[PDB]
Give the backbone structure.
Amino acid sequence: IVRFPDGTLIDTERADNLPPVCDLSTVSDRSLVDIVLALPLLNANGGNLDNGSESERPRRWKSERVNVQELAGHEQSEVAVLRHNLTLRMAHQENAAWLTCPVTRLVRDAQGQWCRDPRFIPPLLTL
Amino acid sequence: MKIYRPLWEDGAFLMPQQFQQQAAWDVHLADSVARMGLAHPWGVVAAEFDDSLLPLSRLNATRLIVRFPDGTLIDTERADNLPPVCDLSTVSDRSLVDIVLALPLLNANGGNLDNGSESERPRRWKSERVNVQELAGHEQSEVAVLRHNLTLRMAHQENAAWLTCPVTRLVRDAQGQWCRDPRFIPPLLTLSASPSLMTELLELLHHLQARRQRLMSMRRENNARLADFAVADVSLFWLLNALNSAEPVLKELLDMPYRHPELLYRELARLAGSLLTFSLEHNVDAVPAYHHETPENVFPPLLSLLNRLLEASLPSRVVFIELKQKGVMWEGALHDARLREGADFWLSVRSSMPGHELQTKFPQLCKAGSPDDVSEVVNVALSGVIIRPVTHVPAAIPLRLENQYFALDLSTDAARAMLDAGRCTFYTPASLGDVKLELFAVLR
Amino acid sequence: MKIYRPLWEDGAFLMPQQFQQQAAWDVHLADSVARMGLAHPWGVVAAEFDDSLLPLSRLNATRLIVRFPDGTLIDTERADNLPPVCDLSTVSDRSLVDIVLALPLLNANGGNLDNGSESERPRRWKSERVNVQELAGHEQSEVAVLRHNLTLRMAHQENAAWLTCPVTRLVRDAQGQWCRDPRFIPPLLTLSASPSLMTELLELLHHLQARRQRLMSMRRENNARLADFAVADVSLFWLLNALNSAEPVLKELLDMPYRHPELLYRELARLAGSLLTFSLEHNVDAVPAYHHETPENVFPPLLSLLNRLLE
Amino acid sequence: MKIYRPLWEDGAFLMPQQFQQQAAWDVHLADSVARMGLAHPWGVVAAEFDDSLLPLSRLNATRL
């Protein structure tokens, strides 16, 4: 559950997804690996992603179809909702996406074992 | 570039080069229409960025209607073209950086898009698939449209292969943040870009209307329906003629955007050409030339020249000089050598005597010291000075206060030795009381 | 004529009669854009010749760009071929020949010319098969390119089913040789097409800046003369108002390439019209009316009117 | 002002009063989440003028 400096709420209870990170052993080092969360910039004319029309500017919306019911009645049907697009990039790659927020910092053990270090501090909204 | 327009009569196999060479000819024809009157290449219509992203440094554009020198139209609302986001974390030199929009050219033997190949030569075309509706009432299908391969680069990189036009300037702020100057101007096809320029040009005209209404009142202050026989009207009727013409011309241009700057440049070059005749020591070299390559100080000195012309007093005057000396014999300087033509003395003070006994209580009310070799008046005086107390005051002397005025007569030699000196002193040692002195020399 | 628009309905096949109609419509759109700034039909952008074949009497060109009064543009750097070489042989004993370029008039029943076999009707649109394809990665195949059919008509060019536009004027030298005359140039869409005019207009302006200079050192050097009412100084203050005003507009227009010459005419007319009733006893009709369809016996007698006033 | 909250069941059909009241209710939640902006009345965050029209005795704003 984060918020972004433009005024954008992200919950991963409702309006959720996240793909996992494929490799960590693209790095031969431990102390530089810190994972960040990215949500791409607002394009003032285009919008979501309904096709394979991958420009140099990614999108940030999707489409999705699930079941929704709240009305006075006991029947559910299917309506199309809107979900954001997140991924977990790294700090030293690029900034054409958004990040502006760390979430962790990974250091390895001498037995080749990545661990989350206990002295990391994200920028905080709450204790 | 060997533009070949095809012809169709019958039986010709269709092939893309008939169409590609056709559409390129319509641009070149439309280019030659514009170069008849204006003699200007293209420029920048509008370039608006996003200010909220600057201290978290990126750079995003919103609208870029930039027009290139060959004749190409880039439009972002009607052709869906935005460059990728320019980084600023690659620059730590915080002096200043310039952002300039670019586009490649080299299509002599194929400037195209082949994504299955790499090259160190850039390319200016790309391909995109959308579903465009027929304008006859039917279902859409998929076509393949083109998008220009725009990019943002910096001025201190290498820019050989591209075709550039500058859009903004970045400075660094006191807290270590980035911000934008309002002082620069891109090359304009319209005044609507760079709104700082529209800010100055409007307040120039509001400054112009301020000067008129006082001068119409100053015509009403003499009511010149007749022969005045002075210079005071012939500059007055003249200065209105420079001002009455330019106002109903410079109004309609600064009502609107979308004029070229050249139409505005001629009226500002004509108006400053007519006011220059009489005030400044400057030649016509001060009015600068038009440089639409980069408009770096073609407009700001031209506006700065106009504001100094708009004080412009009307010279049938009389000198008001403050007589400064640390002793009780106050003294001024800087006498005009012109003043041996028509010299006349009606010098004054401003005192605190409750009646006209200050006549007697100005005890040296004869022979105050003119030349450069008088140190005190109570021991060194002239020969041939009669100081008349003036209680009936003639006109043409503003700010007038009676029972403070007096005249100063001299010889024919005593007037010349003062003017060749340039200095003159005052008679009563009580000038350090509630007394404030003035100078006076009106033309005869 | 009748100029038609096509309609790209689905299920409407293909005719080459269509594409000719659309392509001859934005050409008409180019005029309505342009006819918001025009008095009289158009002229010459540039024209350059090769005079080496004059003792062997022949005349041929090197570089030629002319626009025509129906929206036709002729470009020999990009679009068209050169006209064929002219022969002066039948006019070997005369004195003055005026040479115009020509394209034939077009009727609404014909088209191009079939190989000269039907030479009762002069017709344009020669074809040529050139292979230029290289905007994707290959060059190979061959298409049919249009080329215009230009002539050069010399002494009885008044027999014209042709649109004409003059380019040059031949005179006999006293050794019998034909030579190019440096005289008035057939009309302009520039000032780059007349190296005599660019030479002559500098002699106007450079003469203009020095009379201002001489007037400046008379009065600014004397602080009394800055506001005097002498009968010379009132005229001299008025006369500085004339020269200092219309100078920087003209320096803009003369340090400049191509621009349509009527815009120059509205700036020379004021400077003529200001100075005229100040130092003369003559008619206001000394300022000549602009005539563009003529070969401009206006623009040289206008300059001779100014040069006598400035001294 | 009797700010009504509209009701969408399976037969709720469309009127302009549906939407205007709904837009008014969320403005009303902007006040009652302020427990300091009720402790002083409502503010002014930017107000910038021009003085050039004062010799004409005119006046016009720039930012409000």
